[PDB]
Structure 1
Amino acid sequence: LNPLSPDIWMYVLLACLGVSCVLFVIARFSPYEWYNPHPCNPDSDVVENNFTLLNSFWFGVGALMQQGSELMPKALSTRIVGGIWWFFTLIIISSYTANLAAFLTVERMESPIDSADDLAKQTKIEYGAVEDGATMTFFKKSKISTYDKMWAFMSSRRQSVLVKSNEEGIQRVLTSDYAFLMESTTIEFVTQRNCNLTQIGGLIDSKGYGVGTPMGSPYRDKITIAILQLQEEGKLHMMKEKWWRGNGCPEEE
């Protein structure tokens, strides 16, 4: 059902019920669509028409499926309807065969979800968090409409989707359809070391690591000057590419 969009599949069936009714109205109201059943007695008062309401529906379905039927309209008032519906049913089918011959030769593997918004709705794919870590603390205190609905699942599904460790959480993704939520830096470490995982979505929160000093220390300021020096000359990005990378991944088809 994929090569035509679901808007088209409704618009074809509405046109299939539409043109069938219009061909019924014209053929009953045309003077040249009137035959005789058995012409041994060529008289009047036996004159009838073949286009019933069931037959007019049958010409619409029968011409759409490239099999035809046996009505074969006679007057010009009905052959234009039978002439444009036959041109309509080629362009539908020769675009269904052409588009399905584009799926089966070029396969773009899509993902079901792209963000937390697309994953806020589908409760089939299970949520997840570190048990009472920094991620579970964020969704408990948040007031955003998306992120409060994500907490409505995890409050109802404690000891079901709430794993207590990262090593058992990555394994739970490795077993079932699990959508574990954790910090972005460790995901950039696991995905580069596992070619069966990925990071879908951007960032939810925005925090940062920091070199801790005691309360009111003078050497807080010198490290503050030092870190910004190494960010401009690119020392940290040469280190972040040294540790979080280490294996260029594949995938080819």
Structure 2
Amino acid sequence: VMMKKNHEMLEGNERYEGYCVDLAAEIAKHCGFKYKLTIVGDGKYGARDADTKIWNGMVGELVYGKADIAIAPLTITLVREEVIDFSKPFMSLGISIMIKKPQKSKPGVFSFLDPLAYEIWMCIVFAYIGVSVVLFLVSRFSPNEFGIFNSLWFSLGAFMQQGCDISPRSLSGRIVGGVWWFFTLIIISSYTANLAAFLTVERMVSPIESAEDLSKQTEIAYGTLDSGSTKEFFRRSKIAVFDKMWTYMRSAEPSVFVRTTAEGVARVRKSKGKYAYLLESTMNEYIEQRKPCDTMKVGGNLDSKGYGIATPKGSSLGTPVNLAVLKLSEQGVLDKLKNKWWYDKGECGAKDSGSKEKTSALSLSNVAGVFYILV
């Protein structure tokens, strides 16, 4: 169900748009009836409390006779099965994960010297000053070619390990040439090892996807849509990883249950990966093809539930639906529409298809400012 460019100027069933809107006409053509479209007054699919079990959501609208035939992406479950009637599943689906997409993090224009501290580089500069000054005082005691331009240049070639032009010949000149070598031998090797430290830590980082690691990770929070089936699929469960999720989500503070899907998307974008989200397979896929393009699907699908056309207990019109659901699956009119709205959204640009070339081999931005100092 979509909005419309003529949200106010247009009237009737044409006021909105979408898969089920056109699919309603597909049933209305085949079954031969007239329909009036309504919106759920709550804004939620269906709850069932430890209470009088009034279905706060679209189910109670359909149980209590306000609606006649419900058309919605609604989960076929046993708890709904005993209280309303379902058609055959027209779409395959599963529980899936939406997270903040781990994007290209911003490097530094002087990120190459990050394994050292700027306090160290400040001392390296200051040590480079005095050693040339001390050697020159050692050199020019005339009561020799190491002038002030030579003593800087000899110390510069010493520190870069690129050889030297000449050598000191007096004993005290060789002494300061000795200790400067043992100085720079540590510092270069210390720089190389700590540079390897960042790169080995970076590859050690595991992007969590199996959802058991997500259950073992407490920094990334995770929540579901309330008053539906995903909130209830983890209520009654059997797997210890599912129960630990439910033990985490029951004992969660603050409220990980979000009233609508869009605010559930909104918490993920603000969190920069702090807040994960659980939703259906098809609904997670459609947000990927839209264009913030910062949501991706990790892991495999949990189970295989289904969407079905809902009729109340005793509605005679549910069996002609059972005709048309089979017939439009035979011709593929389901698939004719199930294709149509999902390759239409190519507007993300398919950024995942052309950005899977990530590797630990450096970008130029890792070593960019070295060229800046060079040029």
- Report the Cα offset of residue 154 of structure 1: 0.8
Instruction: Answer yes or no: is 1:185 the counterpart of 2:282.
Output: yes
Matched residue, 1:69: none
Q: Is the 8 A contact 1:213 1:220 kept in 2?
A: no
Superposed, 1:188-207 pairs within 5 Å as 188-193=285-290, 194-207=292-305
Superposed, 1:95-134 pairs within 5 Å as 112-134=207-229
Q: Is the 8 A contact 2:224 2:257 kept in 1?
A: yes
Q: Is the 8 A contact 1:188 1:244 kept in 2?
A: no
Matched residue, 2:104: none
| Structure 2 residue identity aligned to 1:148 | D
2:342 to 238, 241, 244: 241
- Report the Cα offset of residue 137 of structure 1: 1.1
Superposed, 1:167-178 pairs within 5 Å as 167-176=262-271, 177-178=274-275
Which one has the bigger strand percentage?
A: 2
Q: Is the 8 A contact 1:139 1:148 kept in 2?
A: yes
Q: Is the 8 A contact 1:127 1:153 kept in 2?
A: no
Segments of 5+ residues of structure 2 without an aligned counterpart are: 1-188, 359-375
- Report the Cα offset of residue 208 of structure 1: 1.4
Q: For the residues of structure 2 that align with 1:133 and 1:213, how far apart are their CA atoms?
A: 18
- Report the Cα offset of residue 224 of structure 1: 3.2
Superposed, 1:32-47 pairs within 5 Å as none
Q: Is the 8 A contact 2:293 2:348 kept in 1?
A: no
- Report the Cα offset of residue 237 of structure 1: 4.5
Change (3 A) 1:149 1:124: same
1:165 to 252, 260, 265: 260
Q: For the residues of structure 2 that align with 1:125 and 1:241, how far apart are their CA atoms?
A: 30
- Report the Cα offset of residue 113 of structure 1: 0.9
Where relative contact order (Cα < 8 A, 6+ residues apart) is larger, the structure is 2
2:321 to 220, 224, 234: 220
- Report the Cα offset of residue 164 of structure 1: 2.2
Helix, strand or coil for the counterpart of 1:123?
coil
What RMSD, in angstroms, separates the aligned Cα atoms of the two structures?
A: 3.5
1:135 to 189, 214, 230: 230
- Report the Cα offset of residue 244 of structure 1: 5.0
Helix, strand or coil for the counterpart of 1:161?
coil
Which one has the bigger helix percentage?
A: 1
- Report the Cα offset of residue 139 of structure 1: 0.6
- Report the Cα offset of residue 181 of structure 1: 0.8
- Report the Cα offset of residue 160 of structure 1: 3.5
Counting matched residue pairs gives 154
Matched residue, 2:330: 229
| Structure 1 residue identity aligned to 2:215 | A
The percent identity for this pair of structures is 39
Q: For the residues of structure 2 that align with 1:205 and 1:110, how far apart are their CA atoms?
A: 28
Q: Is the 8 A contact 1:231 1:237 kept in 2?
A: no
Helix, strand or coil for the counterpart of 1:168?
helix
Q: For the residues of structure 1 that align with 2:243 and 2:345, how far apart are their CA atoms?
A: 32
Helix, strand or coil for the counterpart of 1:181?
strand
Moved over 3 A (4+): 107-111, 211-218, 230-234, 242-247
Map Cα deviations across residues 203-232 of structure 1 (whole Å, 9 max, x no partner): 113211223456454413321331322339
Q: For the residues of structure 2 that align with 1:156 and 1:126, how far apart are their CA atoms?
A: 12
Instruction: Answer yes or no: is 1:144 the counterpart of 2:239.
Output: yes
Segments of 5+ residues of structure 1 without an aligned counterpart are: 1-92
| Structure 2 residue identity aligned to 1:150 | M
Q: For the residues of structure 1 that align with 2:213 and 2:266, how far apart are their CA atoms?
A: 23
